[PDB]
Amino acid sequence: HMINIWRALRSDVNLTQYTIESAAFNILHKRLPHFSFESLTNMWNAKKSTTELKTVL
């Protein structure tokens, strides 16, 4: 059974954005920093600091 979690939350709760960060904050009360895809691939490249790889993971 495939499930689309964003659609499942769309049917369940009356939010206004239904993003992973928005849903997480509004439901689980956790704030997650959001990074652009360019930032993520910049920090995921090898020869980088252990902090950036840990951050992506």
Partner: peptide
């Protein structure tokens, strides 16, 4: 679990660094 693609032609010690990070 985490699956990462890492060919031998890339920089070495990357798997060790990732394993230490996790």
């Amino acid at each position: 679990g985490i699956m990462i693609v890492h060919k031998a032609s890339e920089d070495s010690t990357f798997p060790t660094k990732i394993q230490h990070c996790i």
